[PDB]
């Protein structure tokens, strides 16, 4: 307000170097790939590992982790920020997790929640 820093300390000056959108949409194509109906019954790493509520929320960390994912580039971080601007999948709000908002029964044998 009166005066003072905007964020340079002592060195620092440009923010985080963003990629270039080859190497995210290749990331956001495996999240629309992992959410498929028929990937779901598939696909029990991302919904069914981070965990087992009613949601269904994924969380970011994980798929750099993923061997499918990971199988991109080292760069694990970008790789977060990437899924930032990826808007059709439902993100957690520091776009660091993926959730969905209307999933579709994979296996009706295999799950019977309540």
Known sequence: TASGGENEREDLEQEWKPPDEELIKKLVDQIEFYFSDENLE??????????????????????????KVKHLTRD?????????????????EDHRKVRRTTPVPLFPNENLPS
Do not use: C, M, P, Q
Not at 42 to 57: C, I, M, P, T, W
């Open 42 to 67: 598939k696909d029990a790493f991302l919904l069914k590992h981070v965990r087992r509520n009613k949601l269904g929320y994924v969380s970011v960390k994980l798929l750099t982790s993923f061997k």
């Open 76 to 92: 694990w971080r970008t790789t977060a920020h990437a899924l930032k601007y990826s808007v059709v999948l439902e993100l957690n």
